[PDB]
Amino acid sequence: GRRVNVNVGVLGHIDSGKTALARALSTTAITLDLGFSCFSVPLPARLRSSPLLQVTLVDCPGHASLIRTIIGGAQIIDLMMLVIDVTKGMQTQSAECLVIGQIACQKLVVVLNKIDLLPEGKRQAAIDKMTKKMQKTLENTKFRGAPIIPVAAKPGGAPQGIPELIELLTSQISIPTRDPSGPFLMSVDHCFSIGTVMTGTILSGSISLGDSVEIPALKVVKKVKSMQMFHMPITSAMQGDRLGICVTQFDPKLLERGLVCAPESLHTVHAALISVEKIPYFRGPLQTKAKFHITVGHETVMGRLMFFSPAPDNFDQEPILDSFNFSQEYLFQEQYLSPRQQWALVEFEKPVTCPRLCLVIGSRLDADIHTNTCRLAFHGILLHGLEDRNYADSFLPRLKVYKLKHKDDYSVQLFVGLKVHLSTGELGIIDSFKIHIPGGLLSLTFKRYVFDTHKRMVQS
Ligand SMILES: Nc1nc2c(ncn2[C@@H]2O[C@H](COP(=O)(O)OP(=O)(O)NP(=O)(O)O)[C@@H](O)[C@H]2O)c(=O)[nH]1
């Protein structure tokens, strides 16, 4: 019968049960990169506004040096189930995976794994102790009271609590505005040749048979032949679905993971004007001109930044994260002021192709794998992306950020005219280090990028 695919993701620390829990699910129904499986339960009544539900279990690596795999693979998922070793506490990458889930998941389900690894007598009041504690950490977040089930996939190296798990799952899972509205975009999980195949997940818009599909790292753009999904050929598919796509002949090595868009939808940004909200759990400073690891899409590149804030006189300005208004002014600042809204401008090393208005996560991933504190610095919408390559001249001169810089009678290069104050209640103006004075006896605003045609010092 007819079906719906929905991507539940399994995220957690290393050796928390993810792969071991994804099996337990798929059956009663390591890990160096995203791995997909799928169980089915009869489709809930509520979901017919689109009979079987098919949960696709996106399995994620735990290894801290593979965070970028997660960040990408959390955009593929609707509901994220955070699996936590119950014996060990809430570990490091776990409390990172919670951040990622906040940034990119709509709903959450905490799982307490390794139940058996506990004193059968005290078995409960520990769960109820780990449960009560989990409530507390989640309190601060948008997943205020997400479910917290205890299970055990491998009672050693039959699994408990798993049938209970799926019914809690087949209830919290929630499909968004499943619009095959906008420009089509697909994350490709596996791509191989037989034609050439692309088992990927759709993110935006629809795609009918024989449509026009661009592959950017492939340098050309083939047309869709067949579309096998639920073991049976389809004539059209849209968001949320996991799909299979046969396109013109080509080779795979030209991609292994990445993006498949509409004919022209995607950018090729060299830099971008981005909404930047800082992540609280990140201890430390976000420093204007500091090269962070930056994840934009199923792609993650190196970028130095520069932060700023709305006018001083217009801080308390609503927070708009849909477009940028290049009319207003913005005071250039040295670090993320910790300004209802604060922006920044990332200038990459290599370029980064991205769907317009995609989320961005700045992070410092040169750190140890056994790191001490969260490594995810800031997230934030990509408010605008400079497509131009020589953009610093071509387009930035359209932004108005400046650095409030500060430093015989009636007459004590490019400052020859600016009214300067002196300490005794006087005016004064530069001239020929001579200074003509009104009557008888600097606070300029250099635009950050105006020199290109103005090198201004014009202050009022
Ligand atoms: N005691 C106990 N051990 C379990 C249970 N479930 C899984 N394990 C143990 O967890 C160990 C590592 O977990 P595993 O699922 O392999 O790793 P993972 O969840 O995929 N994370 P990663 O991707 O880094 O391997 C396994 O060797 C398995 O024996 C459980 O329910 N109880």
Author numbering: 3 to 31, 47 to 67, 84 to 190, 198 to 234, 238 to 381, 407 to 475, 484 to 488, 501 to 520, ...
Article sentences:
As the first step towards addressing the mechanism of decoding of the Sec UGA codon in higher organisms, we determined the crystal structures of the intact human eEFSec in complex with GDP and non-hydrolyzable GTP analogues, GDPNP and GDPCP. The isomorphous orthorhombic crystals of eEFSec:GDPNP and eEFSec:GDPCP diffracted X-rays to 3.4 and 2.7 Å, respectively, while the monoclinic crystals of eEFSec:GDP diffracted X-rays to 3.3 Å. The final models were refined to Rwork/Rfree of 0.24/0.29 (eEFSec:GDPNP), 0.24/0.29 (eEFSec:GDPCP) and 0.30/0.34 (eEFSec:GDP). The asymmetric unit in each crystal form contained either a head-to-head (eEFSec:GDPCP, eEFSec:GDPNP) or a head-to-tail dimer (eEFSec:GDP). Superimposing of eEFSec:GDP onto eEFSec:GDPNP and eEFSec:GDPCP yields r.m.s.d. values of 2.5 and 2.1 Å, respectively. The question was raised whether GDPNP is a faithful mimic of GTP when bound to Sec elongation factors. Our results unambiguously show that the GTPase site of eEFSec is the same when bound to GDPCP and GDPNP, and that both analogues trap eEFSec in the GTP-bound state. Consistent with our structural results, eEFSec binds GTP, GDPCP and GDPNP with similar affinities, while the binding affinity for GTPγS is similar to that observed for GDP; the discrepancy among analogues is likely due to spontaneous hydrolysis of GTPγS. Taken together, our data suggest that GDPNP and GDPCP are equally good analogues of GTP when bound to eEFSec and by extension to SelB, and that previous structural results on the archaeal SelB are valid.
Instead, the cotranslational insertion of Sec into a nascent selenoprotein is promoted by a specialized elongation factor, eEFSec in eukaryotes and SelB in prokaryotes. eEFSec is a translational GTPase that binds Sec-tRNASec with high affinity and stringent specificity, and plays a pivotal role during decoding by delivering Sec-tRNASec to the site of translation in response to a particular in-frame UGA codon. Human eEFSec adopts a chalice-like structure composed of four domains: the N-terminal D1 (residues 1–215), D2 (residues 224–304), D3 (residues 310–455), and the C-terminal D4 (residues 477–575). The height of the chalice is ∼100 Å, while its width is variable; it is the largest at the cup (60 Å), significantly smaller at the foot (30 Å), and the smallest at the stem (20 Å). The N-terminal D1–3 folds into an EF-Tu-like structure (see below) harbouring the GTPase site and the putative Sec-binding pocket. A detailed comparison with a myriad of translation GTPases acting on the ribosome reveals that human eEFSec is a structural chimera of the general translation elongation (EF-Tu/eEF1A) and initiation (IF2/eIF5B) protein factors.
